[PDB]
Amino acid sequence: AIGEFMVSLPRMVYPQPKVLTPCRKDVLVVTPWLAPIVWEGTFNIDILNEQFRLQNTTIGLTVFAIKKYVAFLKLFLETAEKHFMVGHRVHYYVFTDQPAAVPRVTLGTGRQLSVLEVRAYKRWQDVSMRRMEMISDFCERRFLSEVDYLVCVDVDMEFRDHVGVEILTPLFGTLHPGFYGSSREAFTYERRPQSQAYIPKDEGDFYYGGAFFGGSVQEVQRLTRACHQAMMVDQANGIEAVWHDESHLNKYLLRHKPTKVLSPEYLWDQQLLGWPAVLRKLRFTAVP
Amino acid sequence: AIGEFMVSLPRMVYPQPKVLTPCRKDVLVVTPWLAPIVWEGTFNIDILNEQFRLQNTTIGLTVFAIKKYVAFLKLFLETAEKHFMVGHRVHYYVFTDQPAAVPRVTLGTGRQLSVLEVRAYKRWQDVSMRRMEMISDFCERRFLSEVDYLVCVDVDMEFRDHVGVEILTPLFGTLHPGFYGSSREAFTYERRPQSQAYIPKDEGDFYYGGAFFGGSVQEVQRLTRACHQAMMVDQANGIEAVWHDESHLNKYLLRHKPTKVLSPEYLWDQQLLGWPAVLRKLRFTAVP
């Protein structure tokens, strides 16, 4: 559960934080609205693990695997078992058009998987809107009873390093690895005023990736509901945003600021971008 | 109100945050448990003001003025009117043994003051415990109906610069200006194991000042209730902590980590410590 009376932490011995020493000198570690930007060196995972285990935290992971993308699930789940929220309760939700193609992956204790079938829609429009629509319906269903936080990711990926409770907060986005060093005029936001996703050239904090976002169930139900309704307006107006639900996600997080932002450690592509010195760990990566 | 459905922010034009430029290179701006440490240069006050005004935020300030300390109230309130939460709804609660000695200070719109009398206790023990006891009783009374956040400060102080919604969070402490550069063995925590406030030599994140703490009403009612009960145990055991309620506040915030920590900008003494280059603004200061 979240925000509930929480017991005292036990005695712990760790290095004293030093007020007059920055934790990173090469990157921004806090937004202008005082949300942490999560990089290696910003968190002590031992303290955070204690805090979240004392709250009996359950994390849901949602992933959509449609048509040939089912091929990606075996590595995705195997690597999640090695690196995602180890030590905590996890519930994976795999949305697919092919229930029988889901691989039988062995899970650690406290971890479960549900397979949810999707309707194989006739119209590409309903396909484009499907993820936001489905996440928001289950949010008001199983998710509210079953998990405290939801993480929504793409399947054509693998975990290579720790992804844990440091990311948990009411609402988070992740810096897209193609744009974290770019000026805002270069961001690929929707630029046509006729779209609900429109953001003007002089606005924008970050370009967030559609492949990794999440939050508390309530906040994820708000975001996905908003993006789905906005996409439905655009479809009625005969316009499709340049980057589909990612365009809507960016308009949402511009107007409703995330309470944590994840660094590109959490969403990377080594084939296209290599391993820059500013990335001390590559945690969740494109499969080539 | 807090955590309630919040409307979208309006269009705003401001400088793009740059991911590859730290906001401060001379100080730590985030704790190891990912709480922001609030310094000048870490926040855009325009964004935060919008967020908190859209939530119709009311901030209560509590201050105790006993015996000759009533003399400090005129400057304390006059300077609060110039610098504390301007633009937002404020309710000052002045706890005093001398209701008639409270100065008639002119308040801006949306700002009110209540005078609450204290019992002039016979025993110094009940005096030492009085602030935590009284704050926690009103927390379960007027505060829960009347304000969203509570800030609890000492009266022998003056505001010299902005103190605003950047500080608001479920639970905050402030770095004591005497210790922000010290190692933990130097912190004046209670060191006797017989006291409820005991902290061992190898433990401790920061030394927090008893003169400036706060949070949501629920979290402040938890902290003050805990410190009052712990002080009552110590009194039954015939021990008084070295720094009274400040010792208990430190034991509390060690075991229950604050969600924001305020830099010594927010609690300073220029007579004793000058104006170091690391302090870009001196916001709330000892009266000499």
Q: What is the DSSP annotation of A104-129? A: -----TTEEEEEEE----SSHHHHHT
Q: What is the DSSP annotation of B259-270? A: SEEE-GGGSB-H
Number of A to B CB contacts under 8 A, please give it. 142
List Cα–Cα distances, B192 to B196, B197, B201, B237, B251, in angstroms: 9, 8, 11, 12, 13
- Say if residue B228 carries a ligand binding annotation: no
B223, B213 Cβ separation under 8 angstroms: yes
Resolution (A): 1.6
Sign of the C-alpha dihedral, residues A71, A188, A222, B169? positive
Task: Give B266's contacts in chain A (Cβ within 8 Å).
Answer: none
Residue B224 structure tokens: 């003050």
List Cα–Cα distances, B50 to A21, A85, B7, B53, B88, in angstroms: 31, 35, 10, 5, 10
Intra-chain end-to-end CA distance of chain B, in Å: 37
A282, A161 Cβ separation under 8 angstroms: yes
B279, B176 Cβ separation under 8 angstroms: no
What SS3 string covers A83-101? Answer: HECCCCEEEEEEEECCHHH
- Alpha-carbon distance A63 to A92, whole Å? 8
Beta-carbon-side half-sphere exposure of residue B32 (alpha carbons within 13 Å): 19
Beta-bridge partners for A147: none
Nearest to B203 among A3, A11, A166 (CB): A11
Residue A116 structure tokens: 């949810």
Nearest to A33 among B51, B222, B278 (CB): B51
Task: Give B204's contacts in chain A (Cβ within 8 Å).
Answer: 16
- Alpha-carbon distance A167 to A163, whole Å? 8
Q: Is A246 a catalytic residue?
A: yes
* CA of B205 vs chain A CAs: smallest distance (Å): 6
CB distance B32–A47 less than 8 Å? yes
- Say if residue A187 carries a ligand binding annotation: no
Amino acid of residue B55: Q
Closest-CA residue of B relative to A218 is: B5
Residue A239 structure tokens: 């316009």
- Alpha-carbon distance B104 to A238, whole Å? 63
Category of A85 on φ-ψ map: left (φ > 0), alpha (ψ -120 to 50) or beta: left
Contacts of B109 (CB under 8 A, 6+ apart): none
Q: Tell me the helices (H) and strands (E) count for chain B, helix number first.
A: 8, 10
Q: Where are the domains of chain B?
A: 1-288
Closest-CA residue of B relative to A49 is: B33
- Alpha-carbon distance B18 to A31, whole Å? 9
Contacts of B64 (CB under 8 A, 6+ apart): B95, B96, B118, B130, B131, B134, B154, B155
Give me Rg for the CA atoms of chain B.
19
* Per annotation, catalytic residue among A133, A158, A246, A265: A246
Question: A104-123 burial by CB neighbour count: b if 16+ within 10 A, else e?
Answer: ebeeeeebebeeeebeeeee
CA of residue A136 relative to chain centroid, distance: 15
H-helix or E-strand spanning residue B249? helix B244-255
A39, A263 Cβ separation under 8 angstroms: yes
CB distance A18–B8 less than 8 Å? no
Q: Which fold has domain A1-288?
A: Spore Coat Polysaccharide Biosynthesis Protein SpsA; Chain A (3.90.550)
List Cα–Cα distances, B240 to A4, B153, B245, B249, in angstroms: 31, 22, 10, 14
Best mutation target among A6, A16, A259 (most B Cβ atoms within 10 Å) is A16
- Alpha-carbon distance B143 to B4, whole Å? 18
- Alpha-carbon distance A214 to A193, whole Å? 27
Residue B116 structure tokens: 């609450």
| Elucidation technique | X-ray
B263, B38 Cβ separation under 8 angstroms: yes
- Say if residue B100 carries a ligand binding annotation: no
Nearest to B160 by CA among B285, B1, B31, B41: B285
- Say if residue A188 carries a ligand binding annotation: yes
